């Protein structure tokens, strides 16, 4: 029984009080878990199963950031409203006469959403 109750950032297990008396738990045992809004399981859902592994809980990063690329008013808008996951870069382009602040071209989906925030300014 190597795996104690899991601490899960941006979510947790279903049925905490029902399930806790059974911990710690054997390698091979798994449990339904959820991610809070704005967050996603690696299977791209609101829930998945977290497994007790010799190397600890798996997936190791159970909840990931869900960033929707915004409509940009004077921008090249191929990516408008498409879903991207935490870690993803996109190279952003404005119509001539408009540009991104600080002359930046790359925005990344991070813990708190897009960084920097992409907007086409005059």
């Amino acid at each position: 029984k190597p795996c104690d109750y899991p601490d899960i950032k941006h979510g947790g297990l279903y049925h905490e009080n029902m399930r806790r008396p059974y911990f710690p738990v054997a390698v091979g045992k798994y449990y339904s878990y959820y991610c809070d809004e704005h967050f996603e399981t690696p299977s791209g859902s609101y829930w998945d199963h977290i497994h007790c592994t010799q190397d600890g809980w798996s997936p190791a990063v159970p909840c990931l950031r869900k960033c929707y690329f915004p409509y940009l008013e004077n921008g090249y808008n191929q990516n408008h409203g498409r879903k991207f996951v935490q870690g993803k870069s996109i190279d952003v382009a404005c119509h001539p006469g408009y540009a991104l602040p600080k002359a930046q071209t790359t925005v990344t989906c991070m813990e708190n959403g897009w960084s920097p925030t992409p907007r086409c300014i005059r």
Binding site: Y68, G81, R122
Partner: protein, 220 residues
Amino acid sequence: AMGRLNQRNINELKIFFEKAKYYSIKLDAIYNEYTEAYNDIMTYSEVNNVTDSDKSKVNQAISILKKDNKIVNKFKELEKIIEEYKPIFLSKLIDDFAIELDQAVDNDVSNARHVADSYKKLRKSVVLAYIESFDVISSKFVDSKFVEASKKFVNKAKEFVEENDLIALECIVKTIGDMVNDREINSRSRYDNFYKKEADFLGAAVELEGAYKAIKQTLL
């Protein structure tokens, strides 16, 4: 008399340009402050959907828009600059858009989109009011060539505002300035002709400056 008119007409146009010197810059400061909000509203209000629907991002964009009645205060400054030429349509569209902000429904993305569509239409009206204000001052001159070059300029300038309101506004303001201050117009494109409407507008700005120059000269 013809020269006492053309003198006043040259003075009216100069008083316009100085009063409205900052109109392009002021409209851009509004655009820049409110573009992220407008983007957030448009992003989660498409009927094609497939983007969850953070109604709290749309609710936050509407709050940013409404805050301290600021955007309305910012559009009314522009309505004040053009006033001698009667932006009567503009005053109502701002008063109407202010009511649109007052009557906005939290957790309704379709209303949010409608407030955002109203902002965009108002912003292009602010641009058109500047053109309409110029056409008024240019209507009072009598020279055949200047009146024909004025009509062609206003027509070509509205087509340019129809493509991009803010880009149109800056080249329009810079053209009036060039003519008011005895400078020739730069006909070189600033956007490798990305805006298909720039070149015909610039072509028209050069012909008007020659006709305006020709009038000025009768008085020197």
